[PDB]
């Protein structure tokens, strides 16, 4: 808030760490103690290219973001604003440092993730979303690129620029964000002005889409034409591939389906989602009592599991080199290796924006004369 001299004589900048549309992240060191941080330096003159109204609007937006982020401070999983410096030409926002980049790089390098890390990531995201909704604050900017990762697999939300308070009984009627993550309510409101609005709840669909992209490996909805993608999203006809979802439990699929519901009222809430059996765990208890039927059922279940484990082990198949000659995509290791090699070869053409996306790599459609029928 104060004079630039305080910053100048308190923090020593260092080499660059990242770049943005109009801001660059640089490392800084605290003198009175040598602690490392990140500083977001924002130019509010746009290098002298903006008209005064744009500068004023940018300053107002930055101030609103700062004052909204001030209240939420305290949660272990949110970015912490440590210090703030302001001048006529620059803002300096000092934050905790992370170490590694966002989830985009991790997903690109690993292609796809397993359920073990997905469980923890989803638990943390659901807890943060529940806290934010309890504080009557919405985000509307939940994207994989807006999550930071630490050395111990710790993720904290950031990029609260689009967040805004919602007074009770109100209904927002604004359209923002990437088209792929836009809920049906936003599109309906944009097309028709009679829609009441959308709500704290439009922040579930984004979580469901993030889960689907993390698991399957490609976004549920995507197409080369914006109109076709919007129409498909409106229809709501998400489908699971044949040789893609044959090695996943039914609970995960049920949870994903519950998350993505066209009707806003039927959509699962954070508290309801956290109660799903997928997150069920036990530590200790000794108050399990039931009738003889319960004991019989438990013994039968134990015996059945003991019998079934051996059969499940035996259900494996050999390399089947003839099978490889016939069709190599059936085997899981072959598909994994092919995907990894393809991503490594063509991994420099995946970037932010609708023009380029991960779904552009995989081609599950049967390229043939069927491609003639595209749309009306």
């Amino acid at each position: 808030s104060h004079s630039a001299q305080d910053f100048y004589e308190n923090y020593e900048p260092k080499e660059i760490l990242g770049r943005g549309v109009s801001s660059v992240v640089r490392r800084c060191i605290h003198k009175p103690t040598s602690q490392e941080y990140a500083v977001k330096v924002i130019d509010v003159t746009g290098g002298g290219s903006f008209s005064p109204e744009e500068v004023r609007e940018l300053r107002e937006a930055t101030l609103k973001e700062v004052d909204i982020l001030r209240k939420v401070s305290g949660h272990p999983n949110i970015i912490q604003l440590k210090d703030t410096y302001e001048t006529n030409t620059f803002f300096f926002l000092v934050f905790d440092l992370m170490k590694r980049g966002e989830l985009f790089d991790y997903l690109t390098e690993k292609v796809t993730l397993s359920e073990k890390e997905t469980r923890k990531i989803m638990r943390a995201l659901l807890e943060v979303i529940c806290t934010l909704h309890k504080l009557n604050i919405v985000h509307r900017d939940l994207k994989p690129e807006n999550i930071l990762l630490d050395d111990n697999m710790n993720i904290k939300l950031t990029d609260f620029g689009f967040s805004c308070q919602l007074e009770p009984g109100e209904r927002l009627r604004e359209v923002c964000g990437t088209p792929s993550y836009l809920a049906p309510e936003i599109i309906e409101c944009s097309m028709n002005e009679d829609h009441p609005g959308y709500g704290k709840e439009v922040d579930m669909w984004s979580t469901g889409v993030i889960m689907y992209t993390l698991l399957a490996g490609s976004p549920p909805f995507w197409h080369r034409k914006q109109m076709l993608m919007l129409r498909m999203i409106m229809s709501g006809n998400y489908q699971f591939g044949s040789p893609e979802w044959d090695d996943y439990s039914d609970t995960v699929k049920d949870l994903v389906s519950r998350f993505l519901v066209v009707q806003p009222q039927n959509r699962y809430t954070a508290e309801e989602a956290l109660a799903h059996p997928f997150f069920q765990q036990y530590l200790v208890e000794e108050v399990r009592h039931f009738s003889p039927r319960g004991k019989f059922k438990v013994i039968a279940l134990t015996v059945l599991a003991s019998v079934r484990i051996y059969y499940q082990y035996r259900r494996v198949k050999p390399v089947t080199r003839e099978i490889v000659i016939r069709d190599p995509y059936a085997l899981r290791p072959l598909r994994r290796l092919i995907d990894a090699y393809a991503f490594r070869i063509y991994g420099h053409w995946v970037k932010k924006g609708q023009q380029q996306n991960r779904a552009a790599l995989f081609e599950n459609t049967p390229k043939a004369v069927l491609l003639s029928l595209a749309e009306e």
């Binding site: 397993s114 359920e115 073990k116 469980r119 439990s249 039914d250 609970t251 049920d254 059996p277 997928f278 069920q280 765990q281 036990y282 200790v284 208890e285 399990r288 039931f290 009738s291 003889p292 039927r293 319960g294 004991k295 019989f296 059922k297 438990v298 013994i299 039968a300 279940l301 134990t302 015996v303 059945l304 599991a305 003991s306 019998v307 079934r308 484990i309 051996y310 059969y311 499940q312 082990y313 494996v316």
Partner: protein, 144 residues
């Protein structure tokens, strides 16, 4: 969609499977349970089973993995084979019927400290025809 009773039953079964409460099945415990019924899988077989069940090479089984395994819908043919194997385990004697003595012996082998009156009450409640034996239809219906 499961229920509270189903979750409690699954937790009780998992606790029974793990003789020493540690939070993991453990290869030694798995081998002990396998040998209790009269099976002797080799160490390589146990390692292969653990690797197949687990999603990584940690070599341990947690509660979520057990819940996922026990929540699968096995259809009919595989379910029929599993139920036949379970009956054969319970049908060690070549008679095709379940008696109180057989159930008591099975519980004792599994490590259950029950009483004769308790087993008699359990068999009486389970039985429908009142002949003291359980048929295939009753066993299949009670499986759910």
């Amino acid at each position: 969609q499961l229920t509270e009773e189903q979750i409690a039953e699954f937790k009780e079964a998992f606790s029974l499977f793990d003789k020493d409460g540690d939070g993991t099945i453990t290869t030694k415990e798995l081998g002990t349970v396998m040998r209790s019924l009269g099976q002797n899988p080799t160490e390589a077989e146990l390692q292969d089973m653990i690797n197949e069940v687990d999603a990584d090479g940690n070599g341990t089984i947690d509660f979520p993995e057990f819940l996922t395994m026990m929540a699968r819908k096995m259809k009919d043919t595989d379910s029929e084979e599993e139920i036949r194997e379970a009956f054969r385990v319970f049908d060690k004697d070549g008679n095709g019927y379940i008696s109180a003595a057989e159930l008591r012996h099975v519980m004792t082998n599994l490590g259950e400290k029950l009483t004769d009156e308790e087993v008699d009450e359990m068999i009486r409640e389970a039985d429908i025809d009142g002949d003291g034996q359980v048929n295939y239809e009753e066993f299949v219906q009670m499986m759910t």
